[PDB]
Amino acid sequence: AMRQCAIYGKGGIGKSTTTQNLVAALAEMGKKVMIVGCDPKADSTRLILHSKAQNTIMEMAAEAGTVEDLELEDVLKAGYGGVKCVESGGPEPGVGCAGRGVITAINFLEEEGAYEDDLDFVFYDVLGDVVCGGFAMPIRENKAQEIYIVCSGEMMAMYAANNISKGIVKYANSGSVRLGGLICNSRNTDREDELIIALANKLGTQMIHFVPRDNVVQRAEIRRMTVIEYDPKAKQADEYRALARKVVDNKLLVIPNPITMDELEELLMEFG
Amino acid sequence: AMRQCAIYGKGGIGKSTTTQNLVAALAEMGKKVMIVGCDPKADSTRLILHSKAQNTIMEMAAEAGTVEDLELEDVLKAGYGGVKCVESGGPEPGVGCAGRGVITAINFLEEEGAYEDDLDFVFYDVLGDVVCGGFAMPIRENKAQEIYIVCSGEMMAMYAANNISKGIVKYANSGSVRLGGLICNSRNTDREDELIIALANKLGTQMIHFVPRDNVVQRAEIRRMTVIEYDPKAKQADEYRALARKVVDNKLLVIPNPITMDELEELLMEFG
Ligand SMILES: Nc1ncnc2c1ncn2[C@@H]1O[C@H](COP(=O)(O)OP(=O)(O)O)[C@@H](O)[C@H]1O
Ligand SMILES: Nc1ncnc2c1ncn2[C@@H]1O[C@H](COP(=O)(O)OP(=O)(O)O)[C@@H](O)[C@H]1O
Ligand SMILES: [Mg+2]
Numbered sequence: 001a002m003r004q005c006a007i008y009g010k011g012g013i014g015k016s017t018t019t020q021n022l023v024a025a026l027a028e029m030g031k032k033v034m035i036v037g038c039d040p041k042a043d044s045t046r047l048i049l050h051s052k053a054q055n056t057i058m059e060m061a062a063e064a065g066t067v068e069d070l071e072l073e074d075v076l077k078a079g080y081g082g083v084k085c086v087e088s089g090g091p092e093p094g095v096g097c098a099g100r101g102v103i104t105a106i107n108f109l110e111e112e113g114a115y116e117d118d119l120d121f122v123f124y125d126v127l128g129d130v131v132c133g134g135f136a137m138p139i140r141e142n143k144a145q146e147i148y149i150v151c152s153g154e155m156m157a158m159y160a161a162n163n164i165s166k167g168i169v170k171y172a173n174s175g176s177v178r179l180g181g182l183i184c185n186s187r188n189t190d191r192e193d194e195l196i197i198a199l200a201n202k203l204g205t206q207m208i209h210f211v212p213r214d215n216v217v218q219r220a221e222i223r224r225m226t227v228i229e230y231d232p233k234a235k236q237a238d239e240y241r242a243l244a245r246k247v248v249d250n251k252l253l254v255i256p257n258p259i260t261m262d263e264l265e266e267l268l269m270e271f272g
Numbered sequence: 273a274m275r276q277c278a279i280y281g282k283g284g285i286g287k288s289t290t291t292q293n294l295v296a297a298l299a300e301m302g303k304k305v306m307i308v309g310c311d312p313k314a315d316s317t318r319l320i321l322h323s324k325a326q327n328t329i330m331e332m333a334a335e336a337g338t339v340e341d342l343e344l345e346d347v348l349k350a351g352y353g354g355v356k357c358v359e360s361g362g363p364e365p366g367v368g369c370a371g372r373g374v375i376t377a378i379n380f381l382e383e384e385g386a387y388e389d390d391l392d393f394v395f396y397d398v399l400g401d402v403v404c405g406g407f408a409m410p411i412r413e414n415k416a417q418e419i420y421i422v423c424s425g426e427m428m429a430m431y432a433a434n435n436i437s438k439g440i441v442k443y444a445n446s447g448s449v450r451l452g453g454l455i456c457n458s459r460n461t462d463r464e465d466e467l468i469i470a471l472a473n474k475l476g477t478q479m480i481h482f483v484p485r486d487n488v489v490q491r492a493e494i495r496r497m498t499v500i501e502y503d504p505k506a507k508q509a510d511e512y513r514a515l516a517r518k519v520v521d522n523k524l525l526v527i528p529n530p531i532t533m534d535e536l537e538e539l540l541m542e543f544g
């Protein structure tokens with residue numbers, strides 16, 4: 001078996017930093033992991049690969065002729081801890097559907113046997129500002145059974161969490177896609193942990209971890225590394241190790257209860 | 273004539289706050305303005321209407337039967353300074369294309385004669401995290417000739433500005449859609465104005481205004497108002513008046529020059 005997890009959230013909230021560091025901690029533990037980038041930004045694997053970014057399946061298919069001219073070894077690349085990495089890509093802005101590459105990538109990986117029995121986890125890093133087209137496909141087509149939403153006390157980040165939760169509810173009658181938890185990626189504000197705990201309780205889930213804001217993240221990423229690799233003794237490395245432990249141990253997977261905008265606004269008003 | 277402007281930018285960057293305050297300042301000046309919400313969040317007009325949000329064209333068409341059962345007076349609502357307001361709406365998460373309502377709304381408004389000669393400005397408030405479907409339609413179909421991008425020193429906000437600029441370039445051979453400027457919505461960081469000036473110069477445009485971070489915005493929005501209405505003597509009200517003046521006076525509309533990720537990263541490294 002292998003656990004299929006997807007990390008969703010609004011743009012810029014910390015999906016790729018959180019996912020790559022969580023995955024590095026899992027590999028440090030001895031887990032075998034694959035990351036599938038499902039965001040057109042296409043930099044979801046750079047900290048595992050020590051790279052600028054990664055060439056995408058859409059790009060490589062175009063240069064090769066068809067996606068069938070590609071082999072799994074051409075697309076999947078291994079980095080820190082043996083973590084295997086692939087990027088979906090997507091059409092240029094203004095052309096097509098921004099999520100179309102995700103459909104191509106996930107189908108290619110399934111057909112080519114990337115889901116080898118020895119994998120312990122697959123993580124999809126998915127754009128979450130809209131839940132449609134290829135960005136909805138991991139939910140609609142039962143690809144990521146466990147959704148973790150990165151958010152913060154930002155109203156827009158909590159709105160995004162609610163919208164993603166509505167997408168999960170929409171497909172609850174088929175497949176097994178469930179909300180596994182919220183991850184608070186701190187803005188360094190007071191009571192923020194309590195605010196995201198309260199939101200998680202209202203949705204029916206839990207705050208799996210509170211990730212502090214720590215400049216060591218920037219220092220690591222300037223060097224194209226996770227904090228886990230860059231400075232294994234850092235306090236922030238231990239934070240990502242705690243997050244990884246709690247993801248591994250998590251057993252709560254729910255059909256969430258989306259809230260009203262009145263409920264969201266009351267949360268922010270209350271926690272001042 | 274009437275100037276057709278669209279405000280794009282990543283989610284949570286300040287599009288709706290900036291647009292509604294800019295428009296309130298224009299109305300205070302004596303301009304006649306309409307705001308067309310093109311973001312599924314559908315709260316782009318609440319500060320003009322003193323409202324929770326506004327019922328959308330998609331919602332009203334569904335309750336009425338078809339969009340043809342609606343009259344312009346049912347959908348357009350006037351608020352502060354006589355500013356006219358409409359929301360597109362969009363499908364629920366996980367269903368359809370998130371931008372499909374924008375196409376329905378803009379076509380309805382054109383057909384129903386909302387673009388009366390006495391309007392001086394129309395502002396579209398457009399989700400900018402993806403540039404596709406209905407969110408691309410104002411560019412692809414020549415609806416908003418002047419694009420202003422709200423951004424900040426946040427890497428993701430500058431990436432979004434570059435991506436929107438790529439969409440403008442893609443359609444430069446048809447219609448008249450051009451980049452009019454960047455609006456920096458401050459994160460209260462040092463050198464931030466200089467950073468966004470430098471980005472604008474690299475794209476071939478200008479920073480039209482630097483909007484400071486000011487808590488008076490939150491105090492006004494808790495009361496469902498623009499700062500212009502809530503406290504006309506506030507320093508921040510004068511900031512929005514300066515932005516509105518410069519939009520009115522702006523004559524630079526360009527086909528932008530998108531930059532590489534190396535150029536973006538160098539900008540952030542340089543300005544520390
Ligand atoms: N816990 C943190 N502390 C400090 N910086 C962070 C933290 N999490 C994310 N960042 C920074 O925030 C920015 C956006 O994070 P990223 O993971 O790229 O967002 P997303 O993938 O959601 O668009 C990056 O510059 C990253 O270094
Ligand atoms: N200049 C500012 N100073 C203080 N708060 C701001 C400013 N601009 C925006 N905000 C706040 O940021 C949040 C997001 O702004 P909004 O305009 O709703 O973003 P978008 O429409 O781009 O998603 C709102 O809570 C708003 O009050
Ligand atoms: Mg990312």
Ligand SMILES: [Mg+2]
Binds near residue numbers: 288289311315316
């Ligand atoms: Mg908005």
